[PDB]
Assembly symmetry: C2
């Protein structure tokens, strides 16, 4: 998995991810815990993203 | 306040239908082989994302903080 992480001071973290199935998406982790996933856009908060990550992570 | 509905898929794996308080409807299929399929009812009605175990676990680690 190809992962490019950038620290964005005052905004949070940013992860650019490309899958082996050639699917590109961007994940932004704001300092307020809010998750934003672009591909099309979906926004989650801290608790929700953790639950979904628990499911996804198996 | 997440609403999660889980169903077993005979010969496939598990099905998770998820809705948020922000009302975001997505569907996550976890195959027994390890593959993860994520669906979203958005031009493109139902978008799809395909992952394998390693990829899924990494994205989770990113989302899970």
């Amino acid at each position: 998995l190809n992962i490019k992480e950038n620290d964005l001071p005052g905004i949070g973290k940013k992860f650019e991810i490309e899958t082996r199935s050639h699917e590109k998406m961007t994940i932004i982790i704001h300092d307020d815990g809010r998750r934003e996933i672009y591909r099309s856009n979906i926004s989650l908060d801290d608790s929700e993203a953790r639950q979904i990550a628990a499911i996804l992570g198996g």
